[PDB]
Amino acid sequence: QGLLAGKRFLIAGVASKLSIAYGIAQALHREGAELAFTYPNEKLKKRVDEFAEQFGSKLVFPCDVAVDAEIDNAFAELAKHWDGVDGVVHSIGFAPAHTLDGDFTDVTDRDGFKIAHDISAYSFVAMARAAKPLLQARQGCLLTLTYQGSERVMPNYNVMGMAKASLEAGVRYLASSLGVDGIRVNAISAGPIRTLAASGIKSFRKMLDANEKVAPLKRNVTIEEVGNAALFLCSPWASGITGEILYVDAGFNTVGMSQS
Ligand SMILES: NC(=O)c1ccc[n+]([C@@H]2O[C@H](COP(=O)([O-])OP(=O)(O)OC[C@H]3O[C@@H](n4cnc5c(N)ncnc54)[C@H](O)[C@@H]3O)[C@@H](O)[C@H]2O)c1
Ligand SMILES: Oc1cc(Cl)ccc1Oc1ccc(Cl)cc1Cl
């Protein structure tokens, strides 16, 4: 029971055992954390129930982040079980499919823009607000996930690149707001990983192949590697670290073009 013994974390974002949020769950659990989970809808409820049970948790709450009331209620229900929280992991993204398929200028309509930012960036700030009393109780941390398409153009990432740039600025604004309470706020910028959301971005196979060919370690990263980095940033070993975007991409972001 070894780095996170006695600590409690809420995990939002598990869709399958392939999910980044699932590899994060696995790493925190391996070092002693007790876990709670959210689900976005009725259909997902059944799967998240099973996954939680696998980590030895009966703490499973609805949280569609489009709805203020569900965010608020998720943390209200959580506080009936836990008197404080050591961490909240936000591993959630969405944009309507059409926004990610085609020319950016033509396909980025108002509502598609609205939804991508609302789900993928606003929701982190809303979760942080709702979590604040429970995080204050234990000087808990916040963690979210981002992608380098915020800083450089990636094919068909499109408005998700805007929303991720917004999320990363949020990580800094949150860190400054919550830091006085000892609440650290960080993000991992992961390399491409084959998840359910990944199927559904048409350029994903090309991104995954480019990352394998170009990254200094010449291979793709895993949810275990992302989970392990998440474990570090959620632990006391990262007590000097806040507002940080940690790249877990095998060094890809550092290369301008590989040797041919
Ligand atoms: N897989 C990758 O290559 C990759 C790389 C870098 C960053 N990311 C980011 O990692 C995070 C995790 O995604 P993933 O790749 O694990 O995909 P995933 O499909 O496993 O997870 C996406 C999750 O978002 C949740 N979600 C979507 N809309 C929601 C709503 N309204 N309310 C609550 N939850 C909602 C989904 O239910 C799902 O659980 C996302 O922010 C994604 O942008 C992914
Ligand atoms: O951000 C991501 C980056 C990569 Cl390379 C792969 C998957 C990603 O995650 C998503 C991409 C599109 C949608 Cl609609 C929702 C999510 Cl969660």
Domains defined along the chain, listed by start: 1-260 (3.40.50.720)
Residue owning tokens 């990262």: 238
Dig out the tokens for 189 from the structure.
């910028």
Burial of 144 (0-12, 13-18, 19+ CB in 10 A): buried
Ligand 1 centroid from CA 211, angstroms: 19
End-to-end CA distance of the chain: 47
Resolution (A): 1.7
Strand, helix or coil for residue 253: helix
Q: In whole angstroms, what separates CA 181 from the centre of its chain? A: 22
Q: Which residues are tagged catalytic? A: 147, 157
Burial of 139 (0-12, 13-18, 19+ CB in 10 A): middle
Ligand 2 centroid from CA 3, angstroms: 30
How many Å apart are CA 107 and CA 97, to the nearest integer?
10
Ligand 2, atom 5: nearest CA belongs to which residue?
192
Method used to obtain the model: X-ray
